[PDB]
Amino acid sequence: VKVTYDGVYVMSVKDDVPAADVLHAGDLITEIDGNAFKSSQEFIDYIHSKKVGDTVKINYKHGDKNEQADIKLTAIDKKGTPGIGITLVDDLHHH
Ligand SMILES: [Br-]
């Protein structure tokens, strides 16, 4: 048994994107589109495999409750890269 990976912790959320109406700084994202990822890289790769305008299902914990909601992907860079519009603690550019 290897060390446990809980998911990705949100560090910042763009205030003018759909994500701002769901996520908050500090939230832990555990699954995206019904699946658990094993690293921030896999999580990001997955988002990049989608298209701006697509909808992703996000399972996350806010405070002391496991929530679930859909978030529409927006463009996170001038090149059109799809993203939720958040920065992650692993970053220590938006995803
Ligand atoms: Br992270």
Side-chain angles (χ1 to χ4, degrees):
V1 54
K2 45 199 172 185
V3 63
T4 180
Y5 178 64
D6 306 309
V8 61
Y9 291 84
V10 178
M11 176 164 72
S12 174
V13 185
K14 278 173 167 289
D15 54 42
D16 53 359
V17 299
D21 229 37
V22 176
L23 302 172
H24 286 91
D27 293 350
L28 170 66
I29 295 176
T30 58
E31 293 193 354
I32 182 167
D33 279 354
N35 295 294
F37 39 97
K38 290 178 182 59
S39 73
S40 61
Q41 294 300 158
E42 181 189 344
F43 175 82
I44 299 166
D45 287 331
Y46 182 82
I47 294 168
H48 290 191
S49 73
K50 302 305 169 167
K51 302 147 56 183
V52 172
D54 281 356
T55 297
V56 293
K57 179 167 62 179
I58 300 293
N59 287 87
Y60 63 100
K61 55 183 292 188
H62 182 53
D64 53 61
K65 279 185 289 300
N66 290 166
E67 307 294 60
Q68 187 186 71
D70 287 317
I71 302 181
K72 181 156 293 185
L73 296 184
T74 188
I76 50 76
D77 67 18
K78 59 180 184 59
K79 288 305 175 184
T81 303
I84 298 173
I86 57 182
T87 57
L88 317 172
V89 172
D90 200 71
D91 292 321
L92 296 175
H93 277 186
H94 283 65
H95 301 298

